Amino acid sequence: MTINTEVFIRRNKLRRHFESEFRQINNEIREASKAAGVSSFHLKYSQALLDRAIQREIDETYVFELFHKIKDHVLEVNEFLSMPPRPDIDEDFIDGVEYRPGRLEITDGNLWLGFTVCKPNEKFKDPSLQCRMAIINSRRLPGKASKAVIKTQ
Numbered sequence: 001m002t003i004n005t006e007v008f009i010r011r012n013k014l015r016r017h018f019e020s021e022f023r024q025i026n027n028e029i030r031e032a033s034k035a036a037g038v039s040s041f042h043l044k045y046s047q048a049l050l051d052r053a054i055q056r057e058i059d060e061t062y063v064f065e066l067f068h069k070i071k072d073h074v075l076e077v078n079e080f081l082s083m084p085p086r087p088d089i090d091e092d093f094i095d096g097v098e099y100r101p102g103r104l105e106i107t108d109g110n111l112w113l114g115f116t117v118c119k120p121n122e123k124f125k126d127p128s129l130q131c132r133m134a135i136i137n138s139r140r141l142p143g144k145a146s147k148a149v150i151k152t153q
Contacts, residue, residue: 108151
């Protein structure tokens with residue numbers, strides 16, 4: 001019960017803000033991952049997660065500013081791909097992994113911005129993301145806190 005018309009237009013303008021500024025972040029990931037010397041990784045996000053950033057965190061372009069500053073954290077998602085072969089064996093497989101998680105979790109300046117590899121496969125170090133998790137705490141904002149992680153390091 002609000003004039004949800006102009007707001008729908010604002011959350012949609014958010015989906016264009018989300019996608020056009022996501023072309024800015026994935027364009028640094030393609031060029032920087034090429035310039036850092038690793039693969040090139042393809043970005044995909046789950047639109048329900050994003051429906052949370054689209055309606056709870058409406059016109060959260062600040063999201064984009066923290067991830068446009070997070071950008072060099074292409075290197076952390078890259079150093080995550082840059083490891084020796086995933087199998088060394090088929091039994092215990094990840095012998096080059098000293099027990100690490102399947103996602104990257106980055107925080108600072110009110111933003112909890114996370115990236116998860118393409119999860120349904122072989123998981124070839126890191127050459128896709130299947131979830132870019134953008135969730136804040138703000139003004140109007142319904143605000144989440146994860147126990148805390150780090151910003152591009």
